[PDB]
């Protein structure tokens, strides 16, 4: 298993930044939930990794 493929696959569905009200994936350079339920809230964490 190539490490570059794991990096590419984590780029698309693991390296996100999930809002705290809206459990909703955003891009890793986000600052705001893009959705109305959040209230466009500026409260968001990274997606947690594995070990």
């Amino acid at each position: 298993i190539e490490p570059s493929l794991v990096i590419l696959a984590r780029k698309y569905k693991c390296d996100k930044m999930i809002c705290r009200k809206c459990y909703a994936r955003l891009h890793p350079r986000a600052v705001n939930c893009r959705k109305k339920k959040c209230g466009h809230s500026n409260n968001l964490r990274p997606k947690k990794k594995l070990l």
């Binding site: 794991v6 696959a9 569905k13």
Partner: protein, 185 residues
């Protein structure tokens, strides 16, 4: 505040000819014809002779000022697609199960069997300007190629979206068909 005038300029290369008639831009290139309407704008698309195309907007504020760069860059996408059209490269990542991929060229469709060992066959048509082919050289990679970016990248996104592991932990499995490269020539 809404500014008095906010224009942009699109540079037409010499082998490309635009045929615009009232917010209906139609490029014609060596490799293929492409067209898109911009009838959702209060915009006078207008060309200066042969080399230029000037998107303009009189008294736009925001949500209108913000749209002239969008519909300038979309005409630039239509231009670059008909000089040297886009070619996307898509790579297979799998943990254990080797993903098989079928391709014919009736509707240029892709068929993705043995994805995660699922026995459902993921037949997917391509958008109507697009073909694709397997990479004999680089292993486990299918290269998409086309004339429009809104067709090519959307076909690639449908391959990528339909190649997900459901009902599991997506941080570990990571089996799919993802866009790797986004070249032009």
């Amino acid at each position: 505040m809404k500014v008095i005038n906010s224009s942009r300029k699109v540079q037409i290369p010499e082998n490309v000819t635009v045929d615009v008639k009232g917010r209906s831009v139609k490029v014609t290139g060596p490799r293929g014809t492409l067209s898109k309407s911009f009838d959702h704008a209060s915009v006078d698309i207008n060309l200066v002779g042969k080399k230029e195309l000037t998107v303009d907007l009189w008294f736009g504020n925001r949500k209108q000022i913000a749209c002239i760069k969008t519909i300038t860059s979309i005409i630039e996408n239509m231009i670059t697609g008909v000089t040297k059209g886009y070619e996307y490269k898509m790579r297979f990542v799998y943990a254990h199960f080797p993903i098989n991929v079928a391709v014919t060229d009736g509707g240029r469709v892709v068929e993705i069997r043995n994805f995660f060992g699922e026995k459902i066959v993921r037949r997917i048509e391509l958008l109507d300007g697009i073909t694709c082919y397997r990479n004999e050289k680089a292993k486990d990679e299918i290269v998409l190629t086309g004339n429009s970016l809104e067709l090519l990248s959307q076909s690639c996104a449908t391959i990528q979206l339909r190649s997900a592991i459901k009902y599991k932990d997506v941080r570990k499995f990571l089996d799919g068909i993802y866009v790797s490269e986004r070249n032009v020539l």
